[PDB]
Structures are given as structure tokens and as C-alpha cells.
């Protein structure tokens, strides 16, 4: 029985690989060969945000493209005003080992979580004015590695117990559970319509999940090591992944295969964070060698470098209007870069 099922699974994998090979006609490099290159991208640090006492692990932009939240391994959750550099809030956390944070699209909530295996929701607009915990989401048996608000009442979280979950914040219950990864899930990315999301785990695979249906529709392979970062293309029909093998890859949902690889010979450190520009032409990625590289998404050519962080670049983010880029780092500083 076991031999029969193993043979059947191997035959199905062979059929899938054969279909993917058959559907491959031309590479992305061949198609985007007459496109004029973007040239050289020159960005400068417009702002520098200070106030965190320890390494910064996560940051997130608000939908108004002005306010942003960041998380540090000192029990602090700071909300900034990026235009005027002022600090709007500073939330002390019960647990000091936070690893993720999110900003609600409405702007009335922020989320947080880490090694405590809890996702905490904070109310930013309340009667008292002081920020207080609204809900604690328990049920994961591993560290919280990512969370993303769908609306004011739903949030999707990924965990180190190889599981992603969808929550109802009002009741604090898991509405759906997404299983299938064998390694620890490290990152999440919601589609523009919040109807699908992709996750990347430590089994060097990425999966596409139906939020309402609760099933895995596609699985993407090609990375030789742990996937640490994942991001949807602005179109919503492709996504990019960053791994420890010092490479970034682009996958197409409809083609169901990898299209381009973003690697250089003098890069050996892993990618911590990855992000796209508003047009989707630029691919920004953070690295362990303390700087962020800018890639041409259609040519796989490095179009620039953002340097000026004293330590590891841990997090990265592009505003909803495309105006600015924020990078946080283990040197406890947030930098904002503009064209």
C-alpha cells in the first residue's frame, strides 16, 4: 500500500513537471529584450527615525502612506509620523520577543506577535485615548512569524508550527486552518483583492491558498533553502520570493512556474525582506550584508543599491502611492528613501 501510494505520488509529480515543461514556450528574458533599461536608480535617505533601543524586526506602512508602525526586541511598538518625524504612539508589549507587526487598512488597529505564540490586537482609536489590548489570539503551537489584516474583523497569521490560520477577531476563534507545509512558515502576502494569499516556509516551497475555500491550489518550488520573504506583484498574478540561498525568484500564478531569477555572483548572504514598486518594475530586497539592492523586475539587472544601515536589514516597505521606501535594521534605525 505504501509503495503503491509513493509510486502514485511520484507519477503525479512527474506529470505535473511534464505539463509545466510543455507549457514553457519562451523565457521572460527573451520577451523583455527590446525594453529600454531603467538605467540607474538614485535614492537618498530623506528621513531617519530614532527611538528604538534594540534590533528592529518588523515595520508596516499605513494605507494613508504617512503613518507607519515598527517593532523592536525591547517590548516597544512605535507609530511614527513619517513627514514630520514625530512619534504618535509607543505601546509597551507584555512579551519582549516580538517578530511581526501589522497595520489595519482602516487605521484603527495594529497587530503584533512573536515567540509568545500569541497575536495581540491593539485599539488605536478609543475613548480613553490610551492604546489598550483588544484581543489575544491563542491557538498556534509555534512562534508567530507574520500577520496581515484583511479588514477590521479578520486577520491571517502564519506560525512556526507549519500552519497558517484565519481568525475572527470579534470571537477570537480560528475560522480556517491552512495545512500542507512541512517546514516552519516564515512569511505571508495578501492579494490586492484579499481573496488569495501566498506563504513561504522552511521546506523551500511556496503555496497559494484560497481564503474562503481553505485549500491549497498551487505549490511552487525551486529555492534551495528556507524562504524568508514573499510579496505579490501589483497585478496580483505573480509574486516574488527571497531565500537564504542568496537569490530572489519570480513565480507566475497562471503559468504555474518560475519566470526569472534575481542573483549575482558577489552575493552569498540571504534575503530577509522583499518588496515591489507601484508599477511593479522595480524589485527591492533586503540582505544580511547590511544593504538593500534594487532590481529590474523585467531584466534581472541590479538597478541600484540602498546603503547606509550599520547592521542587518530586517524589514522593508513601499508606500501605497509609491512615494517612499522604508527600511528597518538591527542597528535600531528606520530610514526613509525617496527618488
Amino acid at each position: 500500500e505504501l509503495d503503491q501510494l509513493r509510486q502514485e505520488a511520484e507519477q503525479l509529480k512527474n506529470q505535473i513537471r511534464d505539463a509545466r515543461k510543455a507549457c514553457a514556450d519562451a523565457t521572460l528574458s527573451q520577451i523583455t529584450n527590446n525594453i529600454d533599461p531603467v538605467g540607474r536608480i538614485q535614492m537618498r535617505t530623506r528621513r531617519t527615525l530614532r527611538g528604538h533601543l534594540a534590533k528592529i524586526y518588523a515595520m508596516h506602512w499605513g494605507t494613508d502612506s504617512r503613518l507607519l508602525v515598527s517593532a523592536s526586541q525591547d517590548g516597544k511598538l512605535i507609530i511614527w509620523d513619517s513627514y514630520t518625524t514625530n512619534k504618535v504612539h509607543a505601546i509597551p508589549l507584555r512579551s519582549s520577543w516580538v517578530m511581526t507587526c501589522a497595520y489595519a487598512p482602516s487605521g484603527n488597529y495594529v497587530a503584533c506577535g512573536g515567540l509568545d505564540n500569541i497575536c495581540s490586537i491593539y485599539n488605536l482609536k478609543t475613548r480613553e485615548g490610551n492604546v489598550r489590548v483588544s484581543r489575544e489570539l491563542a491557538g498556534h503551537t509555534g512562534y508567530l512569524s507574520c500577520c496581515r489584516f484583511l479588514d477590521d474583523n479578520q486577520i491571517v497569521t502564519s506560525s512556526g508550527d507549519t500552519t497558517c490560520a484565519l481568525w475572527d477577531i470579534e470571537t477570537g476563534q480560528q475560522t480556517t486552518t491552512f495545512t500542507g507545509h512541512t517546514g516552519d512558515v516564515m512569511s505571508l502576502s495578501l492579494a490586492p483583492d484579499t481573496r488569495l494569499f501566498v506563504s513561504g516556509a522552511c521546506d523551500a516551497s511556496a503555496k497559494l491558498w484560497d481564503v474562503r475555500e481553505g485549500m491549497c491550489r498551487q505549490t511552487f518550488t525551486g529555492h534551495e533553502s528556507d524562504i524568508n520573504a514573499i510579496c505579490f506583484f501589483p497585478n496580483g498574478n505573480a509574486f516574488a520570493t527571497g531565500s537564504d540561498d542568496a537569490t530572489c525568484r519570480l513565480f507566475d500564478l497562471r503559468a504555474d512556474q518560475e519566470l526569472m531569477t534575481y542573483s549575482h555572483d558577489n552575493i552569498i548572504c540571504g534575503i530577509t525582506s522583499v518588496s515591489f514598486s507601484k508599477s511593479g518594475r522595480l524589485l527591492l530586497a533586503g540582505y544580511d550584508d547590511f544593504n538593500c539592492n534594487v532590481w529590474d523586475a523585467l531584466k534581472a539587472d541590479r538597478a541600484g543599491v540602498l546603503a547606509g544601515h550599520d547592521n542587518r536589514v530586517s524589514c522593508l516597505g513601499v508606500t501605497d502611492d509609491g512615494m517612499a521606501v522604508a527600511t528597518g535594521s538591527w542597528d535600531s534605525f528606520l530610514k526613509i528613501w525617496n527618488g
Binding site: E1, L2, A9, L12, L28, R217, Q218, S279, N338
Partner: protein, 57 residues
């Protein structure tokens, strides 16, 4: 046992993921190329923006 259940679940999942419809890579690559062209003007990082309307100066 649980091993046979895991194996049959994996086989069943592999059955569903092989039933999807796939377009050619030529069509998929053209769609991404066309999206960048139609939105290249409104990308402040791709095309540098004058300081008149830049809020980070």
C-alpha cells in the same frame, strides 16, 4: 495507521493540483510587460519626482 492516511492525503492533494489549466509562458510574460508599461508614469521611484510635489524634502 496515520502513515497511510498521510500518504493518501498527499496523493489526493497532488490530484487536485494537477487538474488546473495553464496558459503559455509567452502570454503570461506579455501580461506583466504590459502592466509595467501602462503604469510606468505613476511610479515615483521609477521616474524621479520634482520637489514641488514631493512630501519628503
Amino acid at each position: 495507521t496515520a502513515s497511510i492516511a498521510q500518504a493518501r492525503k498527499l496523493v489526493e492533494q497532488l490530484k487536485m493540483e494537477a487538474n488546473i489549466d495553464r496558459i503559455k509562458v509567452s502570454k503570461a510574460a506579455a501580461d506583466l510587460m504590459a502592466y509595467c508599461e501602462a503604469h510606468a508614469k505613476e511610479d515615483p521611484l521609477l521616474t524621479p519626482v520634482p520637489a514641488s510635489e514631493n512630501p519628503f524634502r
